[PDB]
């Protein structure tokens, strides 16, 4: 049956999808959240393993512990993927090193390292990263000048290292606000 009364020029809505939301959206807090909030979303990333999450300047650096890389590796990815992220560093104590060599050095140098650095009361253990990997020391994170200048100063003083990498961010170092 023809019961078409009415059928012309109807009302079609078509919808769109935004190809970009935001260009370029940094937040260290935002990225942080963000991230937080996929690796508690994954279970079975929060069931066995345990990833901490630490950003800043709009980089972000991950380390944590896991029984299995598929976890942590699967958790930076999802939980980040693009958005804001500059940079990813991250480090989970999960496997096993490159080799014997380099594992033996990485913890004497970073002792030393950290022994010297520590006499500093401005520097923190848990504000900057340092980790040796196959005889490359590698420090990271925000500091102020006087602490940027003991890791640097430590990491160039102590001979050994054949070579060295240094993130060294200043953190509001005085900064005027005018």
């Known amino acids: 049956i023809a019961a078409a009364v009415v059928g012309t020029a109807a009302v079609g809505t078509k919808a769109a999808t935004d190809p970009r939301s935001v260009g370029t959206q940094v937040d260290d807090g935002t990225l942080e959240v963000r991230v937080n909030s996929a690796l508690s979303k994954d279970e079975q990333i929060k069931k066995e393993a345990r990833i901490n999450v630490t950003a ?10 896991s029984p299995n890389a598929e976890l942590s590796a699967r958790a ?19 496997g096993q090193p490159i080799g014997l060599g380099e594992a033996s ?41 006087r602490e940027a200048k003991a890791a640097a100063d430590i990491a160039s003083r102590v001979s050994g290292v054949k070579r060295v990498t240094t993130a060294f961010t200043f953190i509001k170092g005085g900064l005027e606000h005018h």
């Open 56 to 65: 800043y300047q709009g980089k972000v650096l991950l380390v944590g512990q």
């Open 76 to 94: 930076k990815q999802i939980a980040m993927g693009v958005d804001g992220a500059n940079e990813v560093y991250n480090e989970i104590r999960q």
């Open 105 to 145: 050095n990485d913890t004497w140098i970073t002792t030393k390292v950290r022994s010297q650095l520590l006499t500093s009361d401005l520097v923190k253990s848990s504000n900057v990263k340092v980790t040796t990997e196959n005889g490359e020391v590698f420090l990271m994170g925000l500091v102020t000048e």
